[PDB]
Amino acid sequence: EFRPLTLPPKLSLSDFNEFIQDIIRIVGSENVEVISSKDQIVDGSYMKPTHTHDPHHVMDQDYFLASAIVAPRNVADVQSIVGLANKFSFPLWPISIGRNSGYGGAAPRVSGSVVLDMGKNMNRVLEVNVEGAYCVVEPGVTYHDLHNYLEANNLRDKLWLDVPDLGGGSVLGNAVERGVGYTPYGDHWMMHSGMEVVLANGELLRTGMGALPDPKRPETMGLKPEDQPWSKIAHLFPYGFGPYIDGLFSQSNMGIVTKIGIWLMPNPRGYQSYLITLPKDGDLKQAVDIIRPLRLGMALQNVPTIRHILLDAAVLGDKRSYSSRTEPLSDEELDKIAKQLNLGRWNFYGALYGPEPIRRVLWETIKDAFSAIPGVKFYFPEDTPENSVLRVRDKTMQGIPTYDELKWIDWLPNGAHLFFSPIAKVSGEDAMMQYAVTKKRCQEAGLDFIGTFTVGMREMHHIVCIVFNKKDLIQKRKVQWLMRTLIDDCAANGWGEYRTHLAFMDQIMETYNWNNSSFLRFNEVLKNAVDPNGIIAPGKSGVWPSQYSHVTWKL
Amino acid sequence: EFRPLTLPPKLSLSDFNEFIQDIIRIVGSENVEVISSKDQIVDGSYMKPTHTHDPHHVMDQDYFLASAIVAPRNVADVQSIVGLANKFSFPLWPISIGRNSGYGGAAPRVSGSVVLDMGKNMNRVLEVNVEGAYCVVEPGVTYHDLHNYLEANNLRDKLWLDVPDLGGGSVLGNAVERGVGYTPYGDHWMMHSGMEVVLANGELLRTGMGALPDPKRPETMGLKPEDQPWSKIAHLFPYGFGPYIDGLFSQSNMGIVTKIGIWLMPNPRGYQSYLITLPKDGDLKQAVDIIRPLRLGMALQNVPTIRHILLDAAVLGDKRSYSSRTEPLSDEELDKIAKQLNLGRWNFYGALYGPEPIRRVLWETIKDAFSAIPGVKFYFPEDTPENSVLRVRDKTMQGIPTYDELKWIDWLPNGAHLFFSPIAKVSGEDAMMQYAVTKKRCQEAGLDFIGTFTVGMREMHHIVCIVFNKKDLIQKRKVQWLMRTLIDDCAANGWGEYRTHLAFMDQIMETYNWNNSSFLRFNEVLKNAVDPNGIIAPGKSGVWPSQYSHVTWKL
Amino acid sequence: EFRPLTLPPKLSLSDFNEFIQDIIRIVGSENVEVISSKDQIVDGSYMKPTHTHDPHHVMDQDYFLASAIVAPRNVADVQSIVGLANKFSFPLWPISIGRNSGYGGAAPRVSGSVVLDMGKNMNRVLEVNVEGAYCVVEPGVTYHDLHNYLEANNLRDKLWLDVPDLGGGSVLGNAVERGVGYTPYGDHWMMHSGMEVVLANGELLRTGMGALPDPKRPETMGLKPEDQPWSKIAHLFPYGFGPYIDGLFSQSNMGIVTKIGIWLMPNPRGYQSYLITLPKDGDLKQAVDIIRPLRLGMALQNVPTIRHILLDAAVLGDKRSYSSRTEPLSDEELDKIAKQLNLGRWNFYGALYGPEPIRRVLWETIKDAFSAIPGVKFYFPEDTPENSVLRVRDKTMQGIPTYDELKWIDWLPNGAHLFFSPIAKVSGEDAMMQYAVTKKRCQEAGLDFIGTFTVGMREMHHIVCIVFNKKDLIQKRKVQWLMRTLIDDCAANGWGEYRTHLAFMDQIMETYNWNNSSFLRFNEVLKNAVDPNGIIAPGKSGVWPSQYSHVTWKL
Ligand SMILES: *Cc1cc2c(cc1C)nc1c(=O)[nH]c(=O)nc-1n2C[C@H](O)[C@H](O)[C@H](O)COP(=O)(O)OP(=O)(O)OC[C@H]1O[C@@H](n2cnc3c(N)ncnc32)[C@H](O)[C@@H]1O
Ligand SMILES: *Cc1cc2c(cc1C)nc1c(=O)[nH]c(=O)nc-1n2C[C@H](O)[C@H](O)[C@H](O)COP(=O)(O)OP(=O)(O)OC[C@H]1O[C@@H](n2cnc3c(N)ncnc32)[C@H](O)[C@@H]1O
Ligand SMILES: *Cc1cc2c(cc1C)nc1c(=O)[nH]c(=O)nc-1n2C[C@H](O)[C@H](O)[C@H](O)COP(=O)(O)OP(=O)(O)OC[C@H]1O[C@@H](n2cnc3c(N)ncnc32)[C@H](O)[C@@H]1O
Ligand SMILES: Cc1ccc(O)c([N+](=O)[O-])c1
Ligand SMILES: Cc1ccc(O)c([N+](=O)[O-])c1
Ligand SMILES: Cc1ccc(O)c([N+](=O)[O-])c1
Q1: Does A518 touch chain C (CB under 8 A)?
Q2: What structural domains and CATH numbers belong to chain B?
Q3: Where exactly is the site Important for the catalytic mechanism (chains A, B, C)?
Q4: What is the DSSP string of C240-280?
């Protein structure tokens, strides 16, 4: 194609054309796609995501957007595209699914960048192994896809998938990002083993035991490396020998991932989701403290989650379906909605897995522990209305994907999500302070507070859900202001953020400044050593190649 | 001091002297120690380890040995020593305890290197936190030290330490090496969070949330960075934000570690070790298969271990105390010794943790499962003689360190350990093949086979114990030959090794050659980028700085 | 000499010795002085200042301190010392007087640095010219010295010196720093013309018209450049032709200044100091607003100053001589002390200069303007007790130096000054907000607020006087905390600082970060271009040469 709406820094249209001309010859025109005009700038839907920019844009819609899109047919193409990118110093921005909304979606940090759609063609579930209780996968496999594959193959009785709320995302895309999930296998990054990735220099590289070569059998002769099988231990033990480099690949521009090993929980032989509604707002504090020991003690098995009242209601209804009021709902109004829905001002969803004797025993401990809270009330999914959030999480908590939760994005008219995500201690006092600070700022911006803690062993990801109408420019600015201020306040109180949207990766990296930004400095060193040309996703997590001046690029 | 018995490559005695002269001015003479003569080359004891070379030398005793030794008083000294090392391009080789015997002990890969004794002065238990259920520590803290600290502080009822067999090693030294331990917290590397290390350039760097700075209070003003407190989440969540670099620090020369966060298991409120003796040699196969599901299913909680007959006997007695025979004992003789000691030809030690109802239920499942094996017999520690290996592991399985196990090193006269450690699937067929291959080679070398599997979730570390008399030069050569051959055979069958001795790190790295040694190549890139001068432990895990020619150095 | 208590970064004692050995050969032993021991670390007095470190240390006393001291005999030596410094890459830190206390005194930012005492030998008043109404001077001339020179020469009737509070400082040292003074000639940096300085490369360079060479007369033949006379216009017009580089020399490490032109106010033919006591604390606001127009309108001629009550009392008495209380005095107590001393809660000192008709007219306007304030009261020096602060400033306001003001440093036991100095608008509202913020933080730290505004045309330097006992380590930390917090708060409100102490130049430079620290980046470029080796005062104002890593050095 001819003229992109915008282009990478320091490059002529003459060069873009020779570059794109060459890519089309490689992947064929069916695969390439140049962004020539506004009618191309459509904000999709979660069901059919837009690969050109951020769907949930806090900033201008056309702010971050690609010059083109390119779907490699397979690994060889990636190696090739990468080679061309080096010739032109054209920036790439890889993606498996494009489903990362609330964190910038498919949009690239630096505009005019070519977006590699790793997912379109490399869609394959490469392997599922019952004895090893794991599988292998390409960037294209969403959670739903895997679930079906297990189900078609009747393997669902043998092994369970762990899954985040909405089911559409890339299994590996979410993994590299360290996204959370609900079962005992909830920490996604923790559950991987052996990976494969294309370096900036286009060379292939497996990791961990992935490096020990599978011995040569007559049947495997002549295979290209990307097609060669993995050795037996590759997916069973992550460490390998020597330095453990896998982390360099999480949340970073060090290289493009092509396949990845992921564990799978054997069917536990027992399950029963549950609920415990906390009556008061202040109950958040005692509940957390009651939880701390249950988590360390292994009473609570999976990643449970304390949900705010509005989150469950957002799933059940629009703000309009509850109040004509155009401002943050009052504590009074919040108490009222809970009475309508039968929920507490906070609501703890969780689960039990195992044979009955284990389950019965755990259930006692849990129920007995939470009783210290006046007014607590325990419901099983059966015990609730056929639309309840519980009936839904009951599936999420057992590997069944769904999409019912997107409904909450609809609280305001033109829904658009934006996640603020500070980490917080498994402490009632710390959790209480974080909530208050986040709430007041929200009120200042005119937004309803909404969030959910997701309980890790020694920590909790506090996930603030900023819903906002994507067409009110004023609200957007208030929102940008909201984010930036929240970042600084929590920072000023020991709180970090585990992930964020393109428009703030720079600010958040800056919070990580102990010892004069020593951490970032070490990374850039690794970065430039690995990708001299800064071809791969420059600016991810705030790491900039030497070519990009921090003055022009930071934000 | 004046003249070291050997010196680093490419360096004058004139330079060694100016270098050492300067170090003495920094750390004071009490801290430095030059190796001038043979009387200095004493092979210590496990209780008082030698810092100058390998105690268990398969190779010549004086092969790998330092030019001097230097104990930094604190972090500032390390930064300083490092700075001098760069001026002279003198190679450093860090160590916390020196306890890594069976993997080369305190000896450096490249001879004449200065050995940093990080442990002598930086001995402090920096923190223990009950709510977070973790602690922080300097290189000097051994497992015993921590246990006492917990016990002095009466905290032992609140939190348990995880511990490897012998208790003397460095808590962090073993952690960076990814050493195994017995409780549920057995995977040491997995249990860390937040670290601190000195880069080749001497700059400080915390990691993970360690990077988010603790807000400034009047009390903490003026503190030097190394003395500054960590932010609240630092030890609670390992990921931080951006690339997860911690692995670059495991089994590698990327930098020197100064402190490290480590988790601690809350007292489980229940415990009972157990034993299950497998009668026949061939029972190894079914036992493994019976185990696979129990492990994934969480029936088996901690890292259990299948011990070979001779290992338990070595603890109970010398080969001489069982046979005047100078060659590998026959299967007949092996069957006989088991009858004497009441053990099976294989013996599964493990444990249960939790309230009685959980414990009772698990015990049923386990006992019921293993019964498929004809002749199995279950003993509790009480049910056995007051010297039994079980009475010992009962302590190991609950965080109590010991030293009773060193007795096995004594099988031959001049005991000397050497660990061959291939990883193997949690499969009876795979486990059986690995054992046979390892045994035959052992027989070829005239050595008794001895080993123990240590069961991970999806894998098992097969630990071959090569005992050999450290004074028979012939036996040593047979042993070198043994190792090298075993490395190649297992390689030729998909088997890797998770760790090894200095004399074979090069060979083992070479097994990891998928795609033309792509893995090693990526590392050297990272290496040279990070330490231009190759000052830090060159050759660790086989990674060589550009200065060392692979022709002269590899081995 | 042999061994300095500390040394510059990256340097051997062997090198220090060869370096110092060579300097001694140049300047002779009388001039050099190595710091070998603690007895050398004496905190002097203002009358006999210590050249080795900070007298008023907020930080550890021995924190910032030189390796040695060297007094060049003349310009040639400076050029030479500089040349040696380049060979060794030894850092220099120039100073004229050492009188910069409350900003770190004679101490160097980077420790172990050699301190050039420019003042000892280069002490000469090079010229005084009545028609041009200016003079020329070396680094050694203090204000008192110049005053005497004028007075010996009977020139005092012809021209007046402008002078800061205490009279001991270097006329040029204070000028390059942009220090303030009391007469109409109060802006010191503004009053200079033509300078001379030694570049990092040791080359000489005059500036402005200083560059146009004085034509050659037989009498001036053979003169060395440093001894050559200036052309006629050199001291009369500052701009010269082409880029105006003089500013590169203010508050920066660009080069060492050797002489400098400075204007002198012709005797005005009339003078009368005055006072106006504002009764209430809140009167600060209206007073400022009444002042704004008087300043722009030229009613107020010199740099007047609004003094806080405690400042005048500190001069009159110790906190102990007013209250046994160990904490910040109450507003009540403050009102009481004013009644005792006859002063307002704020007190405006200023002056009139000119023939009587001008003076009479101005006096009316001023008196009439300030009357809008209820309770104001106007005193002439005559109208007050023979110890009054007014009797003192009456001299300061006419070029007469004094030392009476040091008495205020004595408020606490071990007096030690530390200046916080944010700039503020000539507005009652802005001035009021700044005062409140600064006061509350002071109260938080347990310190009495004390300060004085010094009124510029369109702005006011708010000078917060942090007195603190230099031996209470706790108080010191509270103070460090005080400074750092004040810096951030004022920053968060548009307020900058025109100068500061070594321990905070880095933090303050960071406040100046518009557009991604663009300002600092531009400077480092200029820095490294000019001094490749970073020999000259690295870290001044936060500007670091490329050799110093920002991670290790910043603070
Ligand atoms: C709207 C929403 C989002 C959401 C959620 C609930 C709602 C209502 N619940 C989630 C949850 O419980 N846990 C979670 O982690 N995320 C959840 N989200 C956010 C989002 O939907 C998911 O995180 C989703 O998995 C993200 O999208 P996807 O998984 O498809 O990722 P992507 O679009 O490919 O972007 C991935 C990013 O990582 C890097 N990347 C991706 N692929 C590669 C390859 N092959 N190589 C290198 N880097 C890669 C890119 O930087 C890209 O930005
Ligand atoms: C003889 C023996 C050994 C043994 C064992 C049973 C017997 C009878 N059981 C073990 C077990 O159950 N699990 C295990 O991991 N090891 C066991 N061993 C072997 C050995 O005793 C232990 O592994 C022991 O912990 C190792 O010694 P130590 O822990 O003291 O380690 P070290 O002497 O300091 O050497 C550590 C190596 O790692 C690197 N290193 C160490 N400190 C640093 C720092 N600060 N910075 C950077 N790198 C560091 C070095 O490369 C060094 O070689
Ligand atoms: C305690 C105190 C201080 C004070 C004051 C009242 C009291 C009670 N009143 C002052 C006032 O009204 N105005 C003012 O500007 N300062 C006042 N102070 C602070 C201090 O006493 C004076 O500012 C004093 O003039 C500073 O000391 P001095 O003038 O002697 O300066 P120095 O010791 O030489 O340090 C100068 C700095 O500038 C750079 N420098 C100095 N000479 C050179 C040369 N030749 N070349 C290059 N740079 C040079 C150095 O960086 C040095 O740090
Ligand atoms: C809904 C949601 C969004 C982003 C996250 O990171 C997340 N989590 O549990 O980690 C959950
Ligand atoms: C005894 C021993 C020696 C080395 C190891 O690595 C080990 N392990 O369990 O990992 C156990
Ligand atoms: C007393 C004092 C101290 C530092 C200054 O800067 C100052 N000034 O008027 O500029 C006055």
Answers
A1: yes
A2: 1-123 (3.30.43.10), 124-146+160-210+230-266 (3.30.465.10), 271-501 (3.40.462.10), 502-554 (1.10.45.10)
A3: 165
A4: -SS--GGGGGSSSSS-EEEEEEEE-EEP-S-EEEEEEEE-S
